[PDB]
Write an enzyme that holds these catalytic residues in place. Structure first.
Site, PDB file in Angstrom:
ATOM      1  N   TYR A  23       3.237  -4.357  19.493  1.00  0.00           N
ATOM      2  CA  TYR A  23       3.811  -4.874  18.248  1.00  0.00           C
ATOM      3  C   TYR A  23       4.185  -6.357  18.375  1.00  0.00           C
ATOM      4  O   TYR A  23       3.728  -7.193  17.583  1.00  0.00           O
ATOM      5  CB  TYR A  23       5.008  -4.021  17.821  1.00  0.00           C
ATOM      6  CG  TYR A  23       5.895  -4.652  16.759  1.00  0.00           C
ATOM      7  CD1 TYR A  23       5.469  -4.763  15.432  1.00  0.00           C
ATOM      8  CD2 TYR A  23       7.175  -5.131  17.086  1.00  0.00           C
ATOM      9  CE1 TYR A  23       6.290  -5.356  14.451  1.00  0.00           C
ATOM     10  CE2 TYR A  23       7.999  -5.707  16.122  1.00  0.00           C
ATOM     11  CZ  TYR A  23       7.553  -5.821  14.800  1.00  0.00           C
ATOM     12  OH  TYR A  23       8.379  -6.399  13.848  1.00  0.00           O
ATOM     13  N   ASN A  64       0.808  -1.209   0.000  1.00  0.00           N
ATOM     14  CA  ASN A  64       0.000   0.000   0.000  1.00  0.00           C
ATOM     15  C   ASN A  64       0.841   1.259   0.000  1.00  0.00           C
ATOM     16  O   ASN A  64       0.272   2.352   0.056  1.00  0.00           O
ATOM     17  CB  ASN A  64      -0.982   0.021   1.192  1.00  0.00           C
ATOM     18  CG  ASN A  64      -0.283   0.090   2.560  1.00  0.00           C
ATOM     19  OD1 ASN A  64       0.948   0.176   2.653  1.00  0.00           O
ATOM     20  ND2 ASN A  64      -1.078   0.025   3.630  1.00  0.00           N
TER      21      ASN A  64
HETATM   22  N1  LIG Z   1      13.223  -4.118   9.906  1.00  0.00           N
HETATM   23  C1  LIG Z   1      13.518  -5.169  10.924  1.00  0.00           C
HETATM   24  O1  LIG Z   1      14.453  -5.068  11.638  1.00  0.00           O
HETATM   25  C2  LIG Z   1      12.647  -6.413  11.057  1.00  0.00           C
HETATM   26  C3  LIG Z   1      12.812  -6.997  12.440  1.00  0.00           C
HETATM   27  C4  LIG Z   1      11.877  -8.159  12.767  1.00  0.00           C
HETATM   28  C5  LIG Z   1      10.514  -8.142  12.187  1.00  0.00           C
HETATM   29  N2  LIG Z   1      10.405  -7.436  10.939  1.00  0.00           N
HETATM   30  C6  LIG Z   1       9.142  -7.556  10.259  1.00  0.00           C
HETATM   31  O2  LIG Z   1       9.545  -7.839   8.826  1.00  0.00           O
HETATM   32  C7  LIG Z   1       8.398  -7.189   7.935  1.00  0.00           C
HETATM   33  C8  LIG Z   1       9.053  -6.234   7.005  1.00  0.00           C
HETATM   34  O3  LIG Z   1       9.962  -5.408   7.834  1.00  0.00           O
HETATM   35  P1  LIG Z   1      10.489  -3.967   7.105  1.00  0.00           P
HETATM   36  O4  LIG Z   1      11.606  -3.318   7.864  1.00  0.00           O
HETATM   37  O5  LIG Z   1      10.888  -4.295   5.669  1.00  0.00           O
HETATM   38  O6  LIG Z   1       9.275  -2.894   7.133  1.00  0.00           O
HETATM   39  P2  LIG Z   1       8.920  -1.906   5.856  1.00  0.00           P
HETATM   40  O7  LIG Z   1       8.017  -0.808   6.362  1.00  0.00           O
HETATM   41  O8  LIG Z   1      10.155  -1.307   5.177  1.00  0.00           O
HETATM   42  O9  LIG Z   1       8.135  -2.909   4.774  1.00  0.00           O
HETATM   43  C9  LIG Z   1       6.760  -3.130   5.040  1.00  0.00           C
HETATM   44  C10 LIG Z   1       6.021  -2.797   3.706  1.00  0.00           C
HETATM   45  O10 LIG Z   1       4.553  -3.231   3.946  1.00  0.00           O
HETATM   46  C11 LIG Z   1       3.741  -2.031   3.434  1.00  0.00           C
HETATM   47  N3  LIG Z   1       2.490  -2.179   4.212  1.00  0.00           N
HETATM   48  C12 LIG Z   1       2.306  -1.910   5.499  1.00  0.00           C
HETATM   49  N4  LIG Z   1       1.060  -2.203   5.811  1.00  0.00           N
HETATM   50  C13 LIG Z   1       0.424  -2.663   4.730  1.00  0.00           C
HETATM   51  C14 LIG Z   1      -0.863  -3.134   4.432  1.00  0.00           C
HETATM   52  N5  LIG Z   1      -1.917  -3.178   5.478  1.00  0.00           N
HETATM   53  N6  LIG Z   1      -1.128  -3.532   3.206  1.00  0.00           N
HETATM   54  C15 LIG Z   1      -0.216  -3.510   2.239  1.00  0.00           C
HETATM   55  N7  LIG Z   1       1.004  -3.077   2.486  1.00  0.00           N
HETATM   56  C16 LIG Z   1       1.353  -2.656   3.701  1.00  0.00           C
HETATM   57  C17 LIG Z   1       4.468  -1.014   3.721  1.00  0.00           C
HETATM   58  O11 LIG Z   1       4.317   0.052   2.736  1.00  0.00           O
HETATM   59  C18 LIG Z   1       6.010  -1.539   3.470  1.00  0.00           C
HETATM   60  O12 LIG Z   1       6.353  -1.309   2.063  1.00  0.00           O
HETATM   61  C19 LIG Z   1       7.580  -6.570   8.808  1.00  0.00           C
HETATM   62  O13 LIG Z   1       6.454  -7.391   9.046  1.00  0.00           O
HETATM   63  C20 LIG Z   1       8.378  -6.400  10.191  1.00  0.00           C
HETATM   64  O14 LIG Z   1       7.424  -6.365  11.223  1.00  0.00           O
HETATM   65  C21 LIG Z   1      11.135  -6.134  10.792  1.00  0.00           C
HETATM   66  O1  LIG Z   2      19.244   5.908  17.664  1.00  0.00           O
HETATM   67  C1  LIG Z   2      19.385   4.644  18.298  1.00  0.00           C
HETATM   68  C2  LIG Z   2      18.704   3.525  17.829  1.00  0.00           C
HETATM   69  C3  LIG Z   2      18.878   2.309  18.508  1.00  0.00           C
HETATM   70  N1  LIG Z   2      19.682   2.251  19.574  1.00  0.00           N
HETATM   71  C4  LIG Z   2      19.865   1.064  20.209  1.00  0.00           C
HETATM   72  O2  LIG Z   2      20.367   0.041  19.213  1.00  0.00           O
HETATM   73  C5  LIG Z   2      19.757  -1.074  19.400  1.00  0.00           C
HETATM   74  C6  LIG Z   2      18.985  -1.472  18.140  1.00  0.00           C
HETATM   75  O3  LIG Z   2      17.846  -0.622  18.118  1.00  0.00           O
HETATM   76  P1  LIG Z   2      16.862  -0.535  16.782  1.00  0.00           P
HETATM   77  O4  LIG Z   2      17.703  -0.324  15.523  1.00  0.00           O
HETATM   78  O5  LIG Z   2      15.850   0.565  16.984  1.00  0.00           O
HETATM   79  O6  LIG Z   2      16.161  -2.018  16.619  1.00  0.00           O
HETATM   80  P2  LIG Z   2      15.467  -2.920  17.821  1.00  0.00           P
HETATM   81  O7  LIG Z   2      14.868  -2.068  18.926  1.00  0.00           O
HETATM   82  O8  LIG Z   2      16.454  -3.833  18.455  1.00  0.00           O
HETATM   83  O9  LIG Z   2      14.275  -3.793  17.039  1.00  0.00           O
HETATM   84  C7  LIG Z   2      14.362  -4.124  15.661  1.00  0.00           C
HETATM   85  O10 LIG Z   2      14.524  -5.568  15.549  1.00  0.00           O
HETATM   86  C8  LIG Z   2      13.442  -6.257  16.416  1.00  0.00           C
HETATM   87  C9  LIG Z   2      13.469  -7.648  16.176  1.00  0.00           C
HETATM   88  O11 LIG Z   2      14.471  -8.145  17.018  1.00  0.00           O
HETATM   89  C10 LIG Z   2      11.990  -5.749  16.144  1.00  0.00           C
HETATM   90  O12 LIG Z   2      11.330  -5.676  17.436  1.00  0.00           O
HETATM   91  C11 LIG Z   2      11.862  -4.435  15.416  1.00  0.00           C
HETATM   92  O13 LIG Z   2      10.953  -4.689  14.241  1.00  0.00           O
HETATM   93  C12 LIG Z   2      13.099  -3.767  14.935  1.00  0.00           C
HETATM   94  O14 LIG Z   2      12.960  -2.287  14.979  1.00  0.00           O
HETATM   95  C13 LIG Z   2      18.720  -0.821  20.657  1.00  0.00           C
HETATM   96  O15 LIG Z   2      19.416  -1.402  21.812  1.00  0.00           O
HETATM   97  C14 LIG Z   2      18.534   0.419  20.767  1.00  0.00           C
HETATM   98  O16 LIG Z   2      18.220   0.924  22.169  1.00  0.00           O
HETATM   99  C15 LIG Z   2      20.326   3.356  19.978  1.00  0.00           C
HETATM  100  O17 LIG Z   2      21.055   3.332  20.918  1.00  0.00           O
HETATM  101  N2  LIG Z   2      20.177   4.523  19.358  1.00  0.00           N
END
Ligand SMILES: NC(=O)c1ccc[n+]([C@@H]2O[C@H](COP(=O)([O-])OP(=O)(O)OC[C@H]3O[C@@H](n4cnc5c(N)ncnc54)[C@H](O)[C@@H]3O)[C@@H](O)[C@H]2O)c1
Ligand SMILES: O=c1ccn([C@@H]2O[C@H](COP(=O)(O)OP(=O)(O)O[C@H]3O[C@H](CO)[C@@H](O)[C@H](O)[C@H]3O)[C@@H](O)[C@H]2O)c(=O)[nH]1
Length: 332
Positions: A148, A37
């Site tokens: 979340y 989306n």
């Molecule tokens: N980034 C991380 O560190 C990582 C950590 C663990 C879990 N994950 C999970 O992995 C998945 C992808 O992570 P990400 O960092 O790529 O996030 P992201 O926001 O970059 O990608 C999510 C995409 O889904 C789209 N979207 C959101 N809601 C929607 C909906 N209702 N319908 C259609 N599209 C929708 C968003 O536009 C986005 O393009 C997520 O489910 C996230 O919760 C994130």
């Molecule tokens: O400006 C910042 C950002 C982060 N941190 C620290 O760096 C670590 C990583 O933080 P962040 O990059 O925000 O990721 P997380 O909080 O560890 O969580 C990420 O990875 C998790 C899965 O393990 C998921 O809960 C989330 O989708 C995702 O944001 C944390 O200890 C934070 O407190 C800082 O000190 N400064």
């Protein structure tokens, strides 16, 4: 259309992890359609880099899904689509339960009505909550501490009951901290606003932020700051291709941690950025962020054993180099 090729729907394919997975899926010989989306993903990267069909719409839009699953045959769905800002999930959980739980249930019901019974789900180690051992095994209890993590746990439970009732076969992946970028700079993280540590470190070096804040320096950690298992997004993409192939060959439902089993502290990550960039990074030591556990590291043994997954970019320097290459091009 082409009579051999498996047809995959990727929700969230325009986002960070999903775009890299789409690239690996295409490059492994799958037809991909993206449903996104665009609330956080990027159309231009899909159109100019991924070069696959983009359906702009919501996973919670049942009339759209019914039309879509009737218009084209799909062998499987990969579901990256979600909201993932932990602080906003505490502030405004309604939107998180709507998007992450209701939106997934709607997608699952439409799939079953189209007789698509293979699903790959983006879950998270936030479902564990405060860990009691490390590296965390898949059978560790799940006590998420923010909405979340709770939304992701609820879907994991729905998938289990949908397997019992309808034979839905799903691979649940619990990612740790996704990081890195396509080695050739074609794709990378582009979150607006950006909250993750590694992009924020690199945007400080780029002069796009004035300093990096360290959230907490008094944790029960060797160097006092939080430890996280960072996992390269090309490595996550590879596990998705393996998970997909595992299900098309008739695999039972499974859950896998996707991590390296190695942890890096916030300090080590800032150091890694100072060496890769060779630039100065102003640092400010700030208060803890509420809800951060001191150390989150995932055992990747099950995925290695069962899917043959071997992460290729486990070093922090690889991860931070690729991200640095992407951020210099994308965030000029
Ligand atoms: N980034 C991380 O560190 C990582 C950590 C663990 C879990 N994950 C999970 O992995 C998945 C992808 O992570 P990400 O960092 O790529 O996030 P992201 O926001 O970059 O990608 C999510 C995409 O889904 C789209 N979207 C959101 N809601 C929607 C909906 N209702 N319908 C259609 N599209 C929708 C968003 O536009 C986005 O393009 C997520 O489910 C996230 O919760 C994130
Ligand atoms: O400006 C910042 C950002 C982060 N941190 C620290 O760096 C670590 C990583 O933080 P962040 O990059 O925000 O990721 P997380 O909080 O560890 O969580 C990420 O990875 C998790 C899965 O393990 C998921 O809960 C989330 O989708 C995702 O944001 C944390 O200890 C934070 O407190 C800082 O000190 N400064």
């Amino acid at each position: 259309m082409s009579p051999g090729k498996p047809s995959i729907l990727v929700t969230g394919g325009a986002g960070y992890i999903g775009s890299h997975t789409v690239l690996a899926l295409k490059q492994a010989g799958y037809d991909v359609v993206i449903l996104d989306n665009l609330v956080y993903g990027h159309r231009d990267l899909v159109e100019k880099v991924l070069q696959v069909e983009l359906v702009v719409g919501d996973t919670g839009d049942r009339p759209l899904l019914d039309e879509l699953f009737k218009s084209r045959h799909f062998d499987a769905v990969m579901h990256f689509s979600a909201y993932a800002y932990v602080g906003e999930s505490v502030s405004d959980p309604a939107k998180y339960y709507r998007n992450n739980v209701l939106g997934t249930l709607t997608l699952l019901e439409a799939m079953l009505a189209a007789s698509i019974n293979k699903f790959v789900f983006s879950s998270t180690c936030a479902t564990y909550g405060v860990p009691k051992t490390v590296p965390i095994p898949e059978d560790h209890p799940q006590n998420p501490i923010n909405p979340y993590g709770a939304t992701k746990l609820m879907v994991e439970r729905i998938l289990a009951d949908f397997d019992v009732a309808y034979g839905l076969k799903s691979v649940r992946f619990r990612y740790f901290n996704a990081a890195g970028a396509n080695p050739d700079g074609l794709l990378g993280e582009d979150h607006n606003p950006e909250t993750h540590l590694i992009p924020l470190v690199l945007l400080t070096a780029l002069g796009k932020r004035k300093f990096i804040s360290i959230f907490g320096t008094d944790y029960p950690t060797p160097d006092g700051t939080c430890i996280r298992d960072y996992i390269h997004v090309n490595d996550l993409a590879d596990a998705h291709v393996l998970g997909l192939k595992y299900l098309l060959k008739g695999g039972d439902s499974e859950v896998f941690n996707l991590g390296n089993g190695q942890g890096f502290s916030v300090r080590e990550v800032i150091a890694a950025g100072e060496q890769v960039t060779g630039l100065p990074i102003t640092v400010e030591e700030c208060d803890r962020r509420p809800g951060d556990p001191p150390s989150l590291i995932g055992s990747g043994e099950k995925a290695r054993k069962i899917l043959g997954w071997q992460p290729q970019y486990s070093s922090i320097k690889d991860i931070v180099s690729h991200a640095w290459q992407w951020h210099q091009k994308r965030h000029q």
